Ligand binder design. Structure first.
Ligand code: HEM
Ligand SMILES: O=C(CCCC[C@@H]1SC[C@@H]2NC(=O)N[C@@H]21)NCCCCCCNC(=O)[C@]12C[C@H]3C[C@H](C[C@H](C3)C1)C2
Ligand SMILES: [K+]
Length: 407
């Protein structure tokens, strides 16, 4: 038993492609590369894999977008593979469908959407600068550990009005959930995280301030007050949603720049291209793959899907699709129409996308200004990991500090 689930009778054999989203066979060549094997010409647009309990995978942008739009057939009630993890998952609004999702989404948007971002730009700037300056004269760092991890969690603490001293504890709680070693069930990891949040929400419903947790926990949904349980489930997501996505995305980006002096030089000589370069990086190193559960039997693009079937709808694949972007594996900061679904698509389109772009942009601007020349540490083989949010296990970087400048 290679732990492949028995093929359900409604699934025709010609659609079977046993891709393992947690351990894809081509991983050492890069995680995007490993997933992009689903886009080779003999692979159908929609396939069934017997790995991880058995589930569909939409392999092309067209189908990915369509399924993300159609929440009536493709429900977020069970958004993760394997089924047991999807079933346990209760974060808001990511575990809900419209119409109920819409009210909770509007509340979340108050704490992370556009006007909040335009406002936070300078605390973001300060944080990046102080982290980079602490590393600069060392001539080395573990980028994932020393910059990518501390950065988003500190921004979240700021949004949420949580004290600095809580960072290590909260880092520990979130790592438990998002990088499981198998010592804990997903529901157990969630519970530990909730145990931290339960008291703070209680406190802030009694005595609200103007932080994100206070806005959320005292908000109105469908014309009534939000429950303490709902507030907890939203805060959980606002905490985690901006963590591993940003940590891992920044690591993919920095790994690419470390290996590409010419792309570094382009952005050094033309810093105005940094916003467009962020978008082209978001496409090439897209990293999320969640999904949906069928609400009923449904024929979708010629394939019979059954009520209860899970479907993986990898956000990462759309922008890598040759049918969406010519020469997809190639990074071109002057690509003219960069299409991707890196932030998702449809009713759940990332609410933190504006904050995420500021984090990436500030990072690239501030890093390249201080440390224009860096490389992968000699002889290091960069290891990737695949999953719901794919990523980089560690990123040792080296530079000559004489080539750097303190601003
Ligand atoms: C590179 C960074 C990021 C990526 C790639 C990303 C990706 C995504 C994706 C793909 C979804 C949709 C999931 C689905 O349809 O099931 C999503 C939703 C969400 N994201 Fe992000 N995200 C990022 C950063 C952030 C940040 C910094 C925050 C701030 C807390 C955040 C907050 C949220 C929230 C609240 C939702 C749920 C929206 C809803 O369900 O209506 N994200 N994100
Ligand atoms: O629950 C999981 C998956 C289980 C991984 C273990 C598998 S099972 C068999 C196999 N063998 C092994 O040794 N291991 C594997 N952890 C993954 C992390 C769960 C993260 C939950 C929190 N994140 C979120 O809610 C999200 C929601 C949404 C927006 C953001 C990006 C993405 C979409 C995830 C944040
Ligand atoms: K669920």
């Amino acid at each position: 038993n290679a732990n492949l689930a028995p093929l359900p009778p409604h699934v025709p054999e010609h659609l079977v492609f046993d891709f393992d989203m947690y351990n894809p066979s081509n991983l050492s060549a890069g995680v995007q590369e490993a997933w992009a094997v689903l886009q080779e010409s003999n692979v159908p647009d929609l396939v069934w894999t017997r790995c991880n309990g058995g589930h569909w995978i939409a392999t092309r942008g067209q189908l990915i977008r369509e399924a993300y739009e159609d929440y009536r057939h493709f429900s977020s009630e069970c958004p993760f593979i394997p089924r047991e993890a999807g079933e346990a998952y209760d974060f808001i609004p990511t575990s809900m469908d419209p119409p109920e999702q819409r009210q909770f989404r509007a509340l979340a948007n108050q704490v992370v959407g556009m006007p909040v971002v335009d406002k936070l730009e300078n605390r973001i700037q300060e944080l990046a600068c102080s982290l980079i300056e602490s590393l600069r004269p060392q001539g080395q760092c573990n980028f994932t550990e020393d910059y990518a991890e501390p950065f988003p969690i500190r921004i979240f603490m700021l949004l949420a009005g949580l004290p600095e001293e809580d960072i290590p504890h909260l880092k520990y709680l979130t790592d438990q959930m998002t990088r499981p070693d198998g010592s804990m069930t997903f529901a157990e990891a969630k519970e530990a995280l909730y145990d931290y949040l339960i008291p703070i929400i209680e406190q802030r419903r009694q005595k609200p301030g103007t932080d994100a947790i206070s806005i959320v926990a005292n908000g109105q949904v469908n014309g009534r007050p939000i429950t303490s349980d709902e507030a907890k489930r939203m805060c959980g997501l606002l905490l985690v949603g901006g963590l591993d996505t940003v940590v891992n995305f920044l690591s993919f980006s920095m790994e690419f720049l470390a290996k590409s002096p010419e792309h570094r030089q382009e952005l050094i000589e033309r810093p105005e291209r940094i916003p467009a370069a962020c978008e082209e990086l978001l496409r090439r190193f897209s990293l999320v793959a969640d999904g949906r559960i069928l609400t009923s039997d449904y024929e979708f693009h010629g394939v019979q899907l059954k009520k209860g079937d899970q479907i993986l709808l990898p956000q990462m694949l759309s922008g890598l699709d040759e049918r969406e972007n010519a020469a997809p594996m190639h990074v071109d900061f002057s690509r003219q129409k960069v299409s991707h679904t890196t932030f998702g698509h449809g009713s759940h389109l990332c609410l933190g996308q504006h904050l995420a772009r500021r984090e990436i942009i500030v990072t690239l601007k501030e890093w390249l200004t201080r440390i224009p020349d860096f490389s992968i540490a000699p002889g290091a083989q960069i290891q990737h990991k695949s999953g719901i949010v794919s990523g980089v296990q560690a990123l040792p970087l080296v530079w000559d500090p004489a080539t750097t400048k303190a601003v």
